[PDB]
Design a protein around this ligand. Structure first.
Ligand SMILES: O=S(=O)(O)O[C@@H]1[C@@H](O)[C@H](O)O[C@H](CO)[C@@H]1O
Ligand SMILES: [Ca+2]
Length: 482
């Protein structure tokens, strides 16, 4: 009968920003109940310390030493204008496209008889590119094609692809009341069409059309709690304007599409309690429709905590254990919350220390849906080598037999010019070609560089960097000396 699978992947949430992982100032009751009926992962990693490559890793089953997308690259900077009211907007939006000759996860599900849904941020390819959801195995899409467009929670348009409405490809749905008002300044909050509510409703309409004939695969890529720090001025926000006193404000960034706002500690806390509430409505709806015993639901985040649009990770991180933010190959930039729930399949109230990353999700779903020897089926014969880097963690997720272990995890990132490797207790961060070494068992906060005492380990972990990194012309890093 094949099981349904939902993956809820949010935007710029830290390892320590949820209650069940140890946040002290924000309520997350729906996700904490999910973990209490679920399995909570303690050593789970993003594909990258930043959005586009992390999402590419998940989609491709490849690490950033091999992947086509290894960073954020914009294709809208020199696009022509289009006017929505008095608002000058970009006529083509989005980021670098996925390689059309390497398979992604939505296309494997389609081959296996699933119907496919995706609600929120795409960030896999610009409008008109070789990689938009219509061409890469998505039946029903609604949200933001472009990472930069997602900066505004009250935008001029959102993107749609709907077989059901007989769209021939991606269109723009114009937000008719928003366009009457500026994009920046005092009058911006006169915009009434809030993106995260409108995108959550479309996801919920899709789900209510589902029944126990065809299996369904859903990607809920909601933008909370990414900047800007603007939302509805309702009860959720007011609870936190109460708890936090005094509070700070944000001056704004017109060039970054982050609007000025007051009570920034209140804004950020409200945005996480709002996302928790959405996840409450998903889990209830699955029970309401008799879907709960045959649906796997996973919650995670695309990278480490942020400091954009008035965010204050220092205040919210008071009791946290990990070093660093988004963009850093330090543990705080890559390690993320990961919760799984499947009544009577995934054991309830469990913690799981298995060392795993987003590039492991492709083989994990393949093993769950019955699709055997996926590499030989989907690998491209016209390539000199078609890399697949993942190991399935389906065994440990069902607490059964034969869990296999990585020799290493690997990450590289251009903006901070860093490389990260984890090999058991040992962790390497290369900065501008110089290796730093830490033991995570004696030093989780990565305070003591012990490269001096451990040269045999340093060379081994360089031997991994040399074997795993391939040329990519679009994104570059400095390798250490041989
Ligand atoms: O989470 S990320 O998408 O990496 O956030 C980044 C954001 O920090 C940066 O300012 O602009 C890019 C645009 O591609 C993304 O929106
Ligand atoms: Ca992100």
């Amino acid at each position: 009968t094949k099981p349904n699978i939902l993956f809820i992947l949010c935007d710029d949430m830290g390892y320590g920003d949820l209650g069940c992982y140890g946040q002290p100032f924000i309520r997350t009751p729906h996700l904490d109940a999910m973990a209490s009926e679920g399995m909570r992962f303690t050593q789970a990693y993003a594909g990258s310390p930043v959005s586009a490559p992390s999402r590419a890793s998940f989609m491709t089953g490849q690490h950033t030493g091999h992947c086509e997308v290894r960073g954020n690259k914009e294709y809208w900077t020199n696009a022509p204008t289009v006017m929505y009211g008095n608002n000058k907007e970009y006529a083509v939006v989005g980021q670098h496209p996925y390689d059309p000759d390497h398979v992604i996860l939505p296309e494997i599900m389609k081959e296996n008889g699933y119907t496919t849904g995706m609600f929120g941020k795409w960030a896999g390819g610009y409008e008109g590119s070789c990689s938009t959801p219509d061409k890469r195995g998505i039946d029903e899409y609604f949200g933001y094609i472009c990472q930069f467009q997602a900066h505004l929670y009250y935008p001029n348009f959102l993107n749609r692809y709907s077989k059901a409405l007989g769209d021939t490809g991606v269109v723009r749905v114009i937000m008719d009341e928003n366009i009457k008002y500026p994009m920046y300044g005092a009058d911006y909050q006169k915009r009434p069409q809030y993106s995260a509510d409108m995108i959550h409703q479309k996801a919920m309409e899709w789900l209510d059309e589902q029944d126990g004939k065809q299996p369904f695969f859903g990607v809920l890529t909601y933008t909370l709690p990414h900047a800007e720090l603007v939302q509805p001025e309702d009860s959720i926000l007011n609870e936190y304007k109460e708890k936090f006193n005094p509070d700070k404000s944000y001056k704004g960034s017109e060039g970054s599409r982050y609007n000025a706002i007051t009570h920034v500690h209140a804004q950020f806390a409200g945005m996480i309690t709002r996302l928790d509430y959405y996840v409450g409505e998903v889990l209830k709806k699955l029970k309401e429709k008799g879907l709960d015993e045959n649906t796997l639901v996973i919650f995670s985040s695309d990278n480490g905590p942020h400091e954009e649009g008035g965010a204050d990770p220092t205040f919210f991180g008071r009791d946290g254990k990990l070093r660093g933010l988004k963009r850093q190959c330090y543990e705080g930039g890559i390690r993320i919350p990961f919760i799984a729930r499947w009544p009577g399949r995934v054991p309830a109230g469990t913690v799981n220390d298995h060392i795993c990353a987003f590039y492991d999700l492709m083989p994990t779903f393949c093993e769950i849906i019955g699709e055997k020897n996926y590499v030989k089926k989907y690998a491209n014969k016209d390539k000199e080598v078609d890399y697949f880097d993942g190991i399935s963690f389906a065994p440990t997720l069902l607490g059964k037999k034969k869990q296999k272990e990585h020799d290493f995890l690997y990450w590289e990132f251009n903006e901070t010019n860093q490389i990260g490797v984890r090999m058991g207790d040992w962790k390497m961060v290369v900065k501008k070609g110089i290796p730093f070494l830490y033991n995570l068992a004696t030093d989780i906060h990565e305070d003591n560089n012990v490269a001096d005492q451990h040269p045999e380990i340093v060379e081994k972990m360089k031997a991994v960097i040399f074997a795993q990194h391939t040329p990519n012309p679009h994104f570059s890093v400095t390798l250490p000396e041989k």
